[PDB]
């Protein structure tokens, strides 16, 4: 066929189904996923897009993270047209995908000086070194925040022109535009692709039925990999994917109030960070909690919640603790055993995936979309996205010894931002006997890739025989590159 | 025959509507309430079938808590018998209504001395004087438990026979044992009760229809009294109920393990207290916050969420950090305004009241719906229900200088169970601080009418406009009773 | 006689001593006071040549309280000199009056942000205001500080010029030097002031004798009011001194090592604050804690003790933690009633006082001996010290409303400063009911008379009797006055 | 005869020797000030039962020492009668409590408290000791922080306290009075040849010559005889257990009528307050073994102290006065029991290694000595704890790193700690490994007890190296 089956239906295979249909109004496009949206990352996200908001020192201290870091600013631009034609296919009643312009990032001492104080003065450089508009301002100047004193902030930077989406709204626009623009949307789930002769010949759903294709794009998000390994030899060729799980919350305001900008502190321990994003009718989102893990989970643990509410009222707001809890949210960040995204095309003509993208996957889609329609077109696509091609030997974006050093301050920076209160020789202790089981472990899983400080922590508590596969994954990849 | 009314679809509502199907063939019962049981109590119970786990000091120094305390003790001793009627009219595939037939209570130090200490002698002493059986134990021995050793218990109680239903199951059973008795379901709120010359004629209903009848039992929960202060000189002859705001949670546990008994503390701060009870299918419940609002509330506050995990995490058993949130509970305790049910008949023929039982209706049940369903057949029902008659002056079960006692010891409480962290003077000071401003209210409020303690911080917090208007009530209803 | 008595042997007195021996050779002068110096500020204090880092919001929005920053502006220009002609009569082997050149003030989180953050806008401000050389820095690039993160300092001030003296070897120094330049030291206490017919007399000692003089400057400390309030119509006249009990102690580091500068806070909770004066020999001060007593106290407690080792380990550097506590120094700041100096003449010719100094005697000694020493010879000594006579009317340099927010302040900087760890609604709660005790507090004690915060508070927690005292002693100052 | 050393050991033993050999000179050497002196610094508890830990009475040798204890207690009251007959009224009185309240709260491990707990009151039932569990409302005096206060409280008849300042000068006068001299000079060396002492050289380089030397000199004791031929390897290393504890002027002048005390908690620390006369308190005590000696208190020995006595026994001490922070260095042996008795020299005796309980030891310990002195067997359960011996292996390697993993945990929840949930347990699995891996490098027969371990563990590597060559000759000189 000339036929293109999108399977997903999150920001990534909508937004891609969109593209795809307004560009090629000579094929028919479908679109697989269930309205459940089951382990949906987008629906949880708040969501910010983030671009300056994001940067670490250790993401920019790689070349990968520096090519990573480009491709956030350059999707930034392409935002404000991208929601104007999405919103041009619905009515006022549809409501508004932009929530807010702005971002104030905000420096407090609930956390682990050595994440925070480099992230801060990281964002501030990355800023400067882009001529984008930003100011250093007084914590006395930002609006609507009402701190507990011993957790507030005291430094406080206003980044003008990074703003936030409803998620809930931009996946309903895009659902909207993908049929304005000849999409077909069908309610069922991806099983197998079915390709022979180094080509797809289309999908088997899970209702039994089987879909010819020409072209299929898998946006499955954490599922993605999954998919696409039990075609031949692909389950080597393809990074895997995992849940990096998040919890969020919708949360009605006591006085239905809420701040102008978008609130966040940077990145914190093993990807997670504390943000609040402002929603239309007094309520608000507050994220995220981050954790890889080996296998789904649908449901926050008490852990997650307690830690999100904790830090969100101590932090932020006093208010929010006489607050309405109108909805606990979680859904699973695709993250990439290697800790890129996986892009592009494949050695299986007509088979294509947008995945791996892990914590900013919805700010990047509408530069992500066109990359894949360039491809599938056979454009160039976007300069700087070959690198995160799918079918490749896992990266090593990082040396054992980095990830290492990350790994040991990321596990303490999960005690600071609780935060702990301990005897004052505790951390050095902990400190120096954290790194001997971590180097063991990264020793231990293979001679060549070392997982990344995210993936890193959930392997080491994980079951033996978790730790086992993922030796023999590793020593199966080596083998299929080298 | 002769039509008989139940407003709400509660475990009252309920429990009435079976025992009156069952031995009045005579009538057409016919009860109301939706599906969704908006603030309703009984879905956000364990449930426990608290008598003497519920005893504190306080309540056993007044003649009308003593009063009360004897009905929970009779009621315990129908609920076997109450249970195989009930699971009589289901299958195997129903589910069981009892979930364990023991509790222990522990002491720890998260809590108050002036409430927990004295509660636990006190529990133990009205167990001597029953000649209950039940046995202190060594916490070693209380199985499952793994609390944090900073929050761990020193003493546990082990009593016999005082055990937990499934509070969906037994709504499940009483709807089918209702059905299967000739009772019939009508899903709509009554907004209306009718009378003329002295005499109930029925219900206009939200859906705008009349339903004639001879007899109208209200068990409306937090929503009675409203209901009946319609009718011509009834806002100051019942006692007003307000919300006592309930938030709980049913978790998956890591494991799929539970407790084979009910693990409690005492009642504490304004009648809050902490317990799981156990739950088929590797779910437990925890429980439960307890806030009085002048105004319904059906969402749970970040604050109630918060305490509640971090109270079961660290007291019971740390495994529920890591466990599953399934669902967060909230429903409305019927908070009488006098601090004792509302039981019987009315100045209006044919109109009865069953509610403001807050913390223990559902335990209490089987008793009252036999006591209300013996008055309308003209019996005499439960020896000493009577003090407890709907239609009534406010009863002032305690000293001004008792509740003014009770309401500063109860607010530090909310500081010890948190628990907090300060300088050791503060404690005593905040004490010194908090008597004048109590003092100053209950005198500002009526020279013979003192709200119990829960309802008196309610009052302290709410709005100038709320405490005039309560103003207002208790000089009305003096002016009707003196 | 021509001779001057110089009753005290604090820096004061010394450096009183010292300017009046150097300036008039042909004349006698004799300082009284004895080795032991019970009470004495002078030996406890680090000290810190304090003027912009004494610098509060509070004091710079009253007159009187800008009148006493420029005072200390102008004290530290005569330090340099005053130091080199000290030293002059020494050698290398004396050791060095200086311990640093520069002091560093840390803004952290472990406190009230309506002190910390408006003192540190204070300070910059101030110091812009003076031309003073500073310079905001980055906190990474302060020296030597290891602080627990959930402590450290977000924002860092160097002030350059605004040092530290040993106190110990200042007093070695002012003794040395004043032998030098032909002063008696006689090692014994006055007892009584003697005058008649409008002039001085001379002194009665302890041991029963009798000295004669023409001049008598009372510098005896916190002791200084009680000696002079005996000669007629003085009692009410001369303003209260009260002891401002400060703790500090003397700890050698893990490593012998030592900051480059002073490092401090702001002022804080009640004229307490953090910081750490270098010392020679891997010595270093760490100071220092604020009691105002209506009776002196030579032993510190133990909050004060823990207060000032918990501040200074998380603050500053953990490594404090593992170092040896060499001696906790107790001295008493001369605490005036209504907040400033007595400094200069009498209605007594021949009498001067240089008394209730409070936290900074010793950083305006060199100063306050030459404005003494230029009255003594006809001349108007330093403009800018006449509100501070001390024979005045009680000052009254805020209103009551000023002063009642102020002392609600202080009290919840007490809690933050801790710092506690509370549930979210109780310091709201807690400032609420802190407004009615102390504003009644204020109009009980009298109708014009307001003391300052850091007295209100001891008179809050005094006997009911020390208050009736207050009113008496208030009442008599008004009689006298008006 | 020579008593080298002034502390409660040094002075009981000259005491009893000048009372019971009226025909001999016996000379007491040491210095007013008492460098790193255990017996100024402690309180004291006249500790039997309240000493009590369910891991030392899960040993033979522990058990051994309980013993002792409890027929030590037995000799208290008429030893004090002895000595207070040497002075008149305004000496002032040594004993300042008779009875004593162990109290139970969860300011510290469950796997330490509450195993204490249980195993103090089966000790008392063993043994017929009169005691009973109060109600915790009963006992007087205490205002703890509610979040801090003890649940369950035991009551132990007869074991009480003394002031050790006054047990200091009623035993220098006692000496004095029974014909003893006091030499204010400090033991550099022990004379001996032809197997028998000869005397000793003091530090202003005079010559005391003796035909019995007894050395009770603290923490000092090992090091000045190992310099003997064969005895440094023969006679076990004391190490300091540096204590710190403080005098109190309570806010009132008040004070509780008993000792008030936890049980033995991380390493051999403990929390108690002990009476005084004239509106001071004691409160005790820190414990840290030391590879070198230690004379001030550290800061964050001063601040868990205080803040243990002011949330756990008595808020009022938060507004009390800080007299004195005091520091000794308890002796404590490297394989965990004492050093007491006879040697391979004649005429050369040992009284130390007592660690936590010397004082208390100190009658009976004495008369010990006295009668081995006079050819008599002294008394019955000593001889395991003769001075020249093998290392004692008391515990099973496995054990002791049970123990060291759990009071290294209990140092955290005696804080008491605030941590995630999850945090405790990942500390306890990743500090199993490292201290295997010390205890199988220090030695394959000797395991350093818990207390010692983790002293060993922070040292320098080169102080680990110099242990490893201590435990290799030590099996050279006994194997
Ligand atoms: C808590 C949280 C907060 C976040 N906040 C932000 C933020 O602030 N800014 C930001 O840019 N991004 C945010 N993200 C999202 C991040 O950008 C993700 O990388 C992005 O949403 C990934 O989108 P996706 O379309 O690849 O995957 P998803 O959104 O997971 O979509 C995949 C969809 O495919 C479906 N599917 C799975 N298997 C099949 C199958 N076999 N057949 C058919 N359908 C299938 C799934 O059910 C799902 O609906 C957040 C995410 C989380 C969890
Ligand atoms: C968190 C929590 C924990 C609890 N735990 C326990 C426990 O362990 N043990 C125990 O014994 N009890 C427990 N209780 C419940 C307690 O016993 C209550 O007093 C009891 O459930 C009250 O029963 P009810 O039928 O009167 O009220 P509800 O259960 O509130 O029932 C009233 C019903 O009437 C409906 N209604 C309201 N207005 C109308 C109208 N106009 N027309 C028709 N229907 C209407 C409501 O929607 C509701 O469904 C708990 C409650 C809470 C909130």
Redesign the interface.
Known sequence: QTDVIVVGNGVLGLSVGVEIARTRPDVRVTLLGKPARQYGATPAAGAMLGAFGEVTAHALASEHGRKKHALAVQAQRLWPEWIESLEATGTAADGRIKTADDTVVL???????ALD?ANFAAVLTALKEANAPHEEIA??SVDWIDP?????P??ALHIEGEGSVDSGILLAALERSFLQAGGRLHPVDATEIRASHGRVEGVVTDDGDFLPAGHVVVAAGARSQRLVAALPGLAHRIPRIYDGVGVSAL??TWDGSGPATVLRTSNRAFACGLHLVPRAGGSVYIGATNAVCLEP?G?????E??FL??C???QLH?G???????K?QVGSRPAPIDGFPLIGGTSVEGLWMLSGTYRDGLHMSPLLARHVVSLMDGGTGVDGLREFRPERDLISAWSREEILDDVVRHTMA???E?????????PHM?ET??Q??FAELADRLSDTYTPPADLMTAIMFSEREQQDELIAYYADVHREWH
Chains 1, 2, 3 share one sequence.
């Open positions: 420096l407090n001492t609930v956390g682990h000086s104080d914590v006395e507990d004193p011993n957790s507030r005291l430094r949360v009605d989970r449901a926050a643990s008490i852990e919640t307690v509410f904790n969100a009222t101590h006093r929010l603790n006489g607050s309405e809890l109108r606990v999960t005690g600071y609780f935060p702990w209160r301990l005897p004052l020789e505790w902990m006997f954290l001997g089981p």
